[PDB]
Amino acid sequence: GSLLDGPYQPTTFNPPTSYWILLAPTVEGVVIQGTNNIDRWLATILIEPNVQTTNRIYNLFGQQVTLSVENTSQTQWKFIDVSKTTPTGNYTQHGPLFSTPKLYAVMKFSGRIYTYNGTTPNATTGYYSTTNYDTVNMTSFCDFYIIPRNQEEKCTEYINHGL
Ligand SMILES: CC(=O)N[C@H]1[C@H]([C@H](O)[C@H](O)CO)O[C@@](O[C@H]2[C@@H](O)[C@@H](CO)O[C@@H](O[C@H]3[C@H](O)[C@@H](O)[C@@H](O)O[C@@H]3CO)[C@@H]2O)(C(=O)O)C[C@@H]1O
Ligand code: NA
C-alpha cells in the first residue's frame, strides 16, 4: 500500500518524529521497548487470549522483570504498555488495547510517546509525556512498518481492521 513503508526487520533505532511505527507481532511477549535514559522507560507486552491473572517474566531492557498480567478476553489479544519513571522503580500498566488484527503502533510526537488503546475495531490513542522525547531510541522485537502522522486515520484503520 502507498501509505505503508516496509516491512522492516526487528531493530534498534531512533524513530522519526510524527511517524507511526506499525508493529506486527506473532507470539506473546515483549513487542517493543524504548527509553530516554532520564525518567521514562516504556515497553509494550502482548498477552494471548484467555489468560487468568498470573506472574510472567519479561526481558525488559536486558533484565528479567516479573509482572502480574491477565487477559479476560476469549477472542482478542491484549497489548499493555508498561512504564517506570525511575531506573530502580516498578513498572505500572497502562493503556491496554484489546485487538483482533494483532497490530500495534507507537509514535514520538510533541514531547510524548503515543500508542493505541481501547478495543478494536474502535481503538483510540493515548500518550506518555516524555522528557527530551526525540532522544528516545526504540527496539522493536517484531517486523514493523512506517506510516506518517498526516494519515493517522490510515494507521487507525490498520489497527482496527488489519492490513
Ligand atoms: C495511556 C495513559 O494512561 N496515558 C496517561 C499517562 C500515563 O498514565 C503515565 O505516563 C504512565 O507513567 O500519564 C499522563 O500524565 C499523568 C501522570 O503524570 C500521572 C502520574 O501520577 O499523573 C496524572 O495526573 C493525575 C494528577 O496528578 C492527580 O492529582 C489526579 O487528579 O489524577 C490525575 C490523573 O491520574 C497525569 O495526568 C502523561 O501525560 O504522561 C497522562 C496520560 O493520559
Ligand atoms: Na496502549
> Under a CB-based contact definition with an 8 Å cutoff, are residues 141 and 11 in contact?
no
> Closest Cα partner for 92 from 111, 115, 75, 69?
69
Pick the CATH number of 1-163 from 1.20.210.10, 2.40.128.130, 3.40.50.800, 2.60.120.200: 2.60.120.200
Q: Give dist(CA 144, CA 134) in Å, integer.
A: 19
DSSP 3-state of 102: coil
- Please tell me the distance between residue 79's alpha carbon and the centre of ligand 2 in angstroms: 7
- CB of residue 124 inside a 6 A radius of ligand 1: no
CA-to-CA separations, 146 to 72, 84, 116, 149, 155, in angstroms, rounded: 31, 26, 15, 10, 9
- CB of residue 126 inside a 6 A radius of ligand 1: yes
- CB of residue 127 inside a 6 A radius of ligand 1: yes
Alpha helices, DSSP H, located in the chain: 152-161
Beta bridge partners of 81: 44, 94
> Under a CB-based contact definition with an 8 Å cutoff, are residues 95 and 129 in contact?
no
CA 81 to ligand 1: nearest atom: 1
Who contacts 18 (Cβ-Cβ below 8 Å, separation ≥6)?
107, 108, 109, 148, 149, 150
DSSP 3-state of 133: helix
CA-to-CA separations, 115 to 4, 64, 80, 94, 152, in angstroms, rounded: 18, 24, 10, 10, 11
The x, y and z cell numbers of residue 92, run together, are 505500572
Side chain identity at residue 107, one-letter code? M
Testing ligand 1's pocket by substitution, the residue of 44, 117, 127 carrying the most ligand atoms inside 8 A of its CB is: 127
- Please tell me the distance between residue 9's alpha carbon and the centre of ligand 2 in angstroms: 22
> Closest Cα partner for 117 from 147, 149, 79, 144?
79
Q: Which method was used?
A: X-ray
- CB of residue 114 inside a 6 A radius of ligand 1: no
Sign of CA dihedral 156, 36, 59, 57: negative
User: What are the E-state strand segments in 24-103?
Assistant: 29-35, 41-47, 51-60, 63-71, 77-84, 92-99
The x, y and z cell numbers of residue 102, run together, are 494483532
Who contacts 89 (Cβ-Cβ below 8 Å, separation ≥6)?
none
Q: Give dist(CA 146, CA 41) in Å, integer.
A: 22
Q: Report the first-to-last Cα separation within the chain, whole angstroms.
A: 9
Side chain identity at residue 144, one-letter code? F
